[PDB]
Amino acid sequence: LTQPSSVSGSLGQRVSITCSGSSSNVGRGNYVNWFQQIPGSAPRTLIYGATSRASGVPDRFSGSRSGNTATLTISSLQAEDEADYFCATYDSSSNTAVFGSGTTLTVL
Amino acid sequence: GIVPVACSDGYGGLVTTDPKTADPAYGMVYNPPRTNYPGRFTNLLDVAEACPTFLCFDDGKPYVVTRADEQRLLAKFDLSLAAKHMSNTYLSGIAQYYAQYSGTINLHFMFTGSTDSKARYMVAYVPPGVTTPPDTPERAAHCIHAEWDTGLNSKFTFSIPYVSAADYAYTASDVADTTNVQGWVCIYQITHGKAEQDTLVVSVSAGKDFELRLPIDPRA
Amino acid sequence: SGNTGSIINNYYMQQYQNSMDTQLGNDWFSKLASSAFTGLFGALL
Amino acid sequence: RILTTRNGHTTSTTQSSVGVTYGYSTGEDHVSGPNTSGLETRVVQAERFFKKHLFDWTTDKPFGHIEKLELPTDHKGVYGQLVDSFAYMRNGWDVEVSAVGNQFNGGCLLVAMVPEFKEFTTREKYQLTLFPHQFISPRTNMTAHITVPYLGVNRYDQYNKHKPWTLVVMVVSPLTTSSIGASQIKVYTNIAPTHVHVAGELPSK
Amino acid sequence: QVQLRESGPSLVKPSQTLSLTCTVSGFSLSRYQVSWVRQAPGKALECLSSISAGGSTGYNPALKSRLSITKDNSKNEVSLSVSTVTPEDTATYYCAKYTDNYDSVNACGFYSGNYYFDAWGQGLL
Amino acid sequence: TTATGESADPVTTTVENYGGETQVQRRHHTDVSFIMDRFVQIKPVSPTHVIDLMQTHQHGLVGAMLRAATYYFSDLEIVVNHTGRLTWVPNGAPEAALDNTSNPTAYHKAPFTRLALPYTAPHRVLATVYNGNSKYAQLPASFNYGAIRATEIQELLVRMKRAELYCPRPLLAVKVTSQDRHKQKIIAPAK
């Protein structure tokens, strides 16, 4: 998919990352999965179904998707939040799960 | 000589579900007369049986759309009344109050697609003797199942047989049980012709033999 | 009956006093103890 | 008094059998309960005798040395496939246990079928005769035949999750060997499911 | 606790089949779908293959027939072997367990959007 | 009678065998239904206690008799000395349902309140001992008769009405060691 290479948000300030694909890759009816991966560690799923948080994940993370654009917004940013974020969705035309290029969130 | 009542101790306390009727505190009053008022339903179970309700699905939508990818199983849900798929259904809502339920649960599947599109769907009930649901339309063929082609009659109703070791089964599955209390039920689309973006509406209604008992009060 | 000894029809109906019981369209140990071989097995004197 | 019992196509005949003992009921209870909605179907293929090897009885073993085999045991036969392929099934055990001795060695062995078996504290072993049982002794009968109708809280219970009947053999009298008599006598049990019924039909892998 | 562990060669000679094994502990390998995800160095992830509970063994369409995945419930190990390994396809390999069983299979997980990967494991290159 | 005795046939000898006369016997007191009627105290009792069998002490007469039969079906007549409103719900109903108060509840009374509750177990007959736990050797959770929730319960009394017992098991009466008799102190009038 196509998303910003990096986004910078200060601690205690809400940060929004936007993931945009195509109508086939992300349908209005369809939803996307948000994965947060710390460098040197395996990826962790933060948002599944594009509007919910997996067990063991804090409530600050929020995911909103409109049309072909899926946006993950993090509030009350913390030192642990800095990581590489990947948005994963299934493209019907491709018929294979398609992952985003990758967005790195940096806290000033 | 006054009769000796010899009243008992420790019993006769007012009970919320007690059958005893309280003494009348007012004079007889004749209420406005209503004769053969329309829509009156004597039994809650009859209302669930008479009119079927939709099942919750992905993104709060009842119809199961034909998978874009080559997947023969449209959806698989636990047979227990307290299941996410049936969470929004009316039959589960009345059933939630009752402690346990018995009898077959009827599932009505009605195709809602254009005349040019023709597809074949199979609904298979899997008993709780396996760790997981029939993985595929063939593997699930061995267990009780019905395959119906979509023709002039859009809706095909398959009744889920109720088979369990216990005569009655708890309506809501307890947290301690890590596996479904009763068997999962799976809907499989074995063959679809030009069914891309075609939706089949699936609904659940109380069966003729279906009955509820031991009413209790779970928080909703 | 069990230990009920009040000689009067119970105030509450059977359906509310107990759990009404159903059947499917006995006392095996009484049958056994009754079918008990009594007496000798050979000639008596 | 020779007694011949035939289940399905397999017949076991014991010349020294003292008789057949039925535990809790001459016949089984009504098969079609409110649960399963009449889906249960009787299978006569599974009603066959299957041999099993119990603890070998020896003089060293003392009184109270009970050996318990839970039924249904692992089965490589049609019945074993049937329990694996069917979610709920009910059958009468009809357990037959035969210990062959020279009849010059006198020992009393008590074989009983106890429902929902729980380990005894050995105080219970003295009154363990309450359950249906027969005594296997070389002096009179080398084979004990016990038929018990299946009894459970549920009409049909998955065998993998719970097993209702466990065959238990207890040595009432320690076997006393003699020069003429057999040094030790092995114990084997031929058990054939009776009136087995299956329902729910479980999908194969 | 849920734990996934990957065991395999870090360096392999090209033009050979790469075999990997995922050692699972904490959850029964027969109740949860396992998906193999490979990532390219500093590159977006690419879902590679998956196996459902009953062993659907679905493979990603782009690399389909270049790899075979076999999972054994008794040994609690999921094995993914990739044939014709090449220098271009060099990235960390992640083995994860899907909450659902046979949720997608053709796509290795997250096609429905209801069940999501619970544990991604340590990972292996 | 010189019965074979290896087939375990039920043979009972009588006084008439050697010139004696068999006396009339009345067994109303030892009847299984009659013996179960007496109330048996349940220990320990705590808030939101689940009113189910095998809580009663084994040694207790109602408990020993109940333990004697593997399968028992009866209607309870629970007596609870609650210090707060007590709510009783069916076994199928969840723990959260006790707080609702829509289900049967008894308001506080000066004396302990006695409430008769029907047997709601889904199983055809409850089992004192179950072989193999039921999940996805401990007796299953479904066997409990009901759940009663109160602010605090001083004591709980359980009485079985119309109890039926099947498949008898060993009584296991108190063991006597190094004695020819138990020699317990029987009630004696003061001299």
Automatic annotation (TrEMBL), chain B:
This is Genome polyprotein. It comes from Foot-and-mouth disease virus A. The lineage of its organism: Viruses, Riboviria, Orthornavirae, Pisuviricota, Pisoniviricetes. Lies on the inner surface of the capsid shell. After binding to the host receptor, the capsid undergoes conformational changes. Capsid protein VP4 is released, capsid protein VP1 N-terminus is externalized, and together, they shape a pore in the host membrane through which the viral genome is translocated into the host cell cytoplasm. After genome has been released, the channel shrinks. The chain holds residues 304 to 523 of 736 of the full protein. Residues 31-185 form the Picornavirus capsid domain. It is found in: Host cytoplasm; Virion.
Automatic annotation (TrEMBL), chain C:
Interacts with RNA-dependent RNA polymerase; this interaction allows 3B-3 to act as a primer. Interacts with RNA-dependent RNA polymerase; this interaction allows 3B-2 to act as a primer. It is found in: Host cytoplasmic vesicle membrane; Host endoplasmic reticulum membrane; Host nucleus; Virion. This is Genome polyprotein. Belongs to the picornaviruses polyprotein family. Forms an icosahedral capsid of pseudo T=3 symmetry with capsid proteins VP0 and VP3. The capsid is composed of 60 copies of each capsid protein organized in the form of twelve pentamers and encloses the viral positive strand RNA genome. Upon acidifcation in the endosome, dissociates into pentamers. Cysteine protease that generates mature viral proteins from the precursor polyprotein. In addition to its proteolytic activity, binds to viral RNA and thus influences viral genome replication. RNA and substrate bind cooperatively to the protease.
UniProtKB/TrEMBL annotation, chain D:
Residues 13-176 form the Picornavirus capsid domain. It is found in: Host cytoplasm; Virion. Lies on the inner surface of the capsid shell. After binding to the host receptor, the capsid undergoes conformational changes. Capsid protein VP4 is released, capsid protein VP1 N-terminus is externalized, and together, they shape a pore in the host membrane through which the viral genome is translocated into the host cell cytoplasm. After genome has been released, the channel shrinks. This is Genome polyprotein.
Automatic annotation (TrEMBL), chain F:
CDD domains: rhv_like (cd00205). GO terms for molecular function: structural molecule activity. Residues 2-135 form the Picornavirus capsid domain. Keywords: Capsid protein, Host-virus interaction, Viral attachment to host cell, Virion, Virus entry into host cell. GO terms for biological process: symbiont entry into host cell; virion attachment to host cell. Its main location: host cell. GO terms for cellular component: host cell; viral capsid. This is Genome polyprotein.
